[model samples]
Target chain A: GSISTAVIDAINSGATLKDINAIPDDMMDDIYSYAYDFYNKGRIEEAEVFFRFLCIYDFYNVDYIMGLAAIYQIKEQFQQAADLYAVAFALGKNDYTPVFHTGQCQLRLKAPLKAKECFELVIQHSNDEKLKIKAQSYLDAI
Target chain B: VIDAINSGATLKDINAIPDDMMDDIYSYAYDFYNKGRIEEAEVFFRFLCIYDFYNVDYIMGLAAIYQIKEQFQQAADLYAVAFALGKNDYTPVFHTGQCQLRLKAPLKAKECFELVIQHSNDEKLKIKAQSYLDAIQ
Candidate 1:
């Protein structure tokens, strides 16, 4: 089955459920809560559905994008995850967490240079000392 | 068409994020923790603790998570950090005591309970600490 145009009709427009489907904000909160819950429960198949709907309706939200990318990464869809994470990094004002995720994706894809670049960005830009150490460890392996 | 998201398609108004992002993530993290999703909670807690190093909630959450996973040494270390950051909070000290108990260091656990008894005004906490002390005795 092809993707629905109804969802494709909205992208980065800042239109939420109210703007898109006359839906209330509270339901969106439930949707998001279930999305994270399902993902944590290892129900990635269902989690993907929630995030897909979320990404479609509220495409500008970087967390929604990252949620989708996280599913892809764990499912070994590295290229897709990396591409989405790159977009998230750009759209989220240079957030390096996405890039850190992208680094892992690239490492899995065997593009060490690209992964190293991502890790380098994380080490320099990320405020997380713990995250930076992990990124540094990845760089060391590279 | 999501590929179009990266094609310089500027947003008219960004969705509910940036400012609300931390709170949103915190709610999600708390939800995960409440639902017994320890691993999920751990990941989000770690992410939150890293980004907001001063947040006692995140530190304590992650420390409690590690404690749940039975990594008492790591839990103890993190609980200590959390205790130092949040001096008024007795929860971390209580957890660190639990970690010590798990690590088979009953003396350390006793010292923790004593400290809690000396400082925490919460009667429930004091009663709990008293039970632990009685168990050690």
Candidate 2:
């Protein structure tokens, strides 16, 4: 109840677009750390707000996009998750993790051909044996 | 405990634990989860739930895996059971809100979050629940 009762009551009625739009950039670092902890602790729904807030301010950040995509994946919204993973993959270029997730999400969404292409790409570039094995398994399934 | 598994304790080693030392087994399962051995941890947690149906740790451990797997409805159901069983622990209540939010049941989610706000002594948890409530509205 540290927040004013009036403000809390107003928000309870329904948070406004203004509320969503008015985050402070000064709090970005703390919010990012807080959000990452929630995600790390497996509290995806709690983590979503902070990442969503950060994404608005840092639209080009691959890590933030990936974090949000991971949350979306946990929520079973595979298409949006896949789209965000694609953005992260494009942004990160050589970072195979995003595309790996993109492949998984696409597979879940039943776009097997496209998913196979992504896994193939991952297999071609990543030296991590576990990742390659996973990619190959996807390809085999397809 | 997690290190023991990461260092290569097999499923047989976990199964060999005596009933009297079940708390240690629960700790091992928790350690696996905390260390990100999600799939391995999930098996042990589920096994524990089969035996200790109302134990909060076992329920929460399994629920955490469900959350990780995007199985929001299953996680919410388990969290609800944990909430009913956990006399002093509020984490299940808070987690119920999280799962319900993912399921798009805002009113039910808000109710769960409010319970955390009302009873939790942890300032961070209260803030988290409050933030979630504000977002839903």
Candidate 3:
């Protein structure tokens, strides 16, 4: 009850989710699940609303931007997807997924050179063997 | 396109658009709105409203933009315009009720939703109206 009530109160008072230091992981997980369900249902507008709410409160959170980017990608809106993934990548400098997706979207938008830079970043930072191989293959193709 | 619209174009400039360009303008605006580019969408929708003050579509589009932005007072006003122009159509009325509810005017919202229930033949509209009424109660 404190969790739900606290979140609602924080929202009403214009407090960012990040400002609510005691926010439980379960709450974030539930919001993510709800947002993803809407995205999976092809209700992109509803999904955008849910993710946009999260982005407003958790402005620097990579996961929220990633969720929004996924929706844009599903809609074939490559430019918007690329922009969101760039933000996510900036926020998640150590996470390879954002770099990988940013490169993928850039490739889709016909920016091979920019995409190559993203793949290189992934190759430099990521420790996953399969991901390194994938990045190398993309770099080779570029 | 959004940049052009948001450039403080005069009503005369917007109203001066050739009939041939109207469809292109509307399409661009609708595309931005559908893509969740809310700020760009709002600019175009506002331009459309200024271009043709009496166009119900433009009014409704702007109202929906305001609704999404949580500007309930502005949304309610635009929805009221759309409700006036869209007499037999229950859609604008329902939206007006929704904005009213958000604005904390349950009595006004109840009246609007009640009107929808009285006039709309669709079962879905009836159900939606009933739910709003139930919530208000």
Candidate 4:
């Protein structure tokens, strides 16, 4: 709604947006893909809008939750990002990606001990060897 | 959801759509297309082709919609793309023949029909094409 081209038309005319329930799950993934794409290409605000929509529609999807969290992280809103990352971490059954990102946001917020807890768990829980090393490096720094 | 329609060009290069999703998209697009909802179908098919441009069916569906809307010239070009991308699929050639005739180019239709009859094994397809070929003469 914020991205509309014609404000007058939107203001004057009754707007129509389809309900998320009307959309198929597969198409939702397609939408998420676009949001993820926007996020990767530095379309942060647009990605923010998209991720916000995704998080609202599919609250149970950890990827959608994490996507919005990442948008917040990139925008330097560390507290909000850290909070959303916590939601993603919980919803994902302790997925290391969001935990790892929570560590990154905490580091930016200058919370060394909190950030240390994040990286330590990531090092313990993540099967990704590359991620573990990154976590170890962060831990060493802390 | 409609808000992100603006991001299609950049999204094309991203792995935004999985091939598994194409079948579902196509089913919905095809349903709208067959139900006299050409424009709605077009939005889905256009993005379908953009996301999975390599899929012959996606391109063919869009071309067929253009054909239905009587944009024969554009339809022919799209059918040409569909034909080139399809492996041993002469459906595009058949569709192009229809487009050529509607565009008032009998000879071009003749070429497309001949290509279809010669290369395609579908008896009904060849029979329909043979009617067009014989009628052109």
Cα error, candidate 1, residue B40 (Å): 51
Compose the digit string of candidate 1's lDDT tens values, residues A118-142. 7987887688888999999999999
Worst 10 residues of 2 chain A by lDDT: A1-10
What CA RMSD would you report for each candidate? 18.1, 18.5, 21.1, 20.2
State the lDDT at B70 in candidate 3: 91
**Residues A12-72, candidate 3, lDDT per residue (tens digit)?**
3344456676556688778888998998888889988888777655544678878888888
Model 3 quality (TM-score): 0.43
Q: Which stretches of candidate 4 lie over 4 Å from their true place?
A: A1-142, B1-14
Please report the candidate that would top TM-score against the real structure: 1
Task: Summing lDDT over every window of 10 consecutive residues in candidate 3 chain A, give the lowest-scoring window.
Answer: A1-10
lDDT of 2 by residue, A1-142 (tens): 1011112222132453434756565576688889999989988878998787766555446777778888898899887677567556433445778778988988888888878877987897777879999889889988
Q: Residue B7 deviation, candidate 3, in Å?
A: 23
Expressed as tens digits, the lDDT of each residue in A53-91 for candidate 4 is 765454446677677777777779886777667555433
Q: Output the lDDT of residue A119, model 3.
A: 87
Task: Give me the overall lDDT of model 2.
Answer: 0.68
- Which docking band does candidate 2 fall into? incorrect
DockQ value for model 3: 0.01
Q: Give TM-score, chain B, model 2.
A: 0.77
Q: lDDT (0-100) at residue B119 of candidate 3?
A: 50
> What does the lDDT read for residue A50 in candidate 1?
93
